[PDB]
Amino acid sequence: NKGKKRRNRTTFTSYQLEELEKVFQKTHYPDVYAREQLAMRTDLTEARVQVWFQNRRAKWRKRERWSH
Amino acid sequence: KKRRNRTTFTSYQLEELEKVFQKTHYPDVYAREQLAMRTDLTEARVQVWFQNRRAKWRKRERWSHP
DNA sequence: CGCTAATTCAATTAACG
DNA sequence: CGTTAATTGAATTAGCG
């Protein structure tokens, strides 16, 4: 099935991915405040940061052996 | 420490959201981007509003199925 | 084709008045 | 406490070297 017109796929920079990953290592579920400070520091929207964390947890769960 | 924050919509914001819901239950990105300007909300809050509004609507159909 | 960003859902949690 | 906005995993869609 084909979905309706969607937002253009965001291409992140080397800096952005490295910066987001540092926060992911501290916590997989950052509060709104943590995400907003990452959104300003990386010049991203709080929305793109929240979707990145949603997908980063999905990638981590797939590779993970343990229950958590 | 409040982990998440909450958006309290104005009556005008709700009129403009419900207007687009009655035209299209699944607005495209171009349609959502317009509401973001019209209602001063982010496109992100329009997605979230629309998915709760859809969930809310499907519950009605399940109750009035016979 | 692999990786991953974006968008749906059902179930559930938590902010606000 | 009631209302409902926000968040989550899971599934899925799809852009793009």
UniProtKB/Swiss-Prot annotation, chain B:
S-S pairs: none
Assembly description: Binds DNA.
Gene behind the chain: ALX4
Full protein segment contained here:
213 to 274 of 411
| Name this polypeptide is given | Homeobox protein aristaless-like 4
Residue ranges forming the DNA-binding region read 2-61
- What is the documented function of this protein? Transcription factor involved in skull and limb development. Plays an essential role in craniofacial development, skin and hair follicle development.
**Cellular localisation:** Nucleus
State which disorder the record connects to this protein. Answer: Parietal foramina 2: Autosomal dominant disease characterized by oval defects of the parietal bones caused by deficient ossification around the parietal notch, which is normally obliterated during the fifth fetal month. PFM2 is also a clinical feature of Potocki-Shaffer syndrome.
- Summary of the tissues where the protein is detected: Expression is likely to be restricted to bone. Found in parietal bone.
Organism for this UniProt entry: Homo sapiens (Human)
On the tree of life, the source organism's domain of life is Eukaryota
Similarity remark:
Belongs to the paired homeobox family.
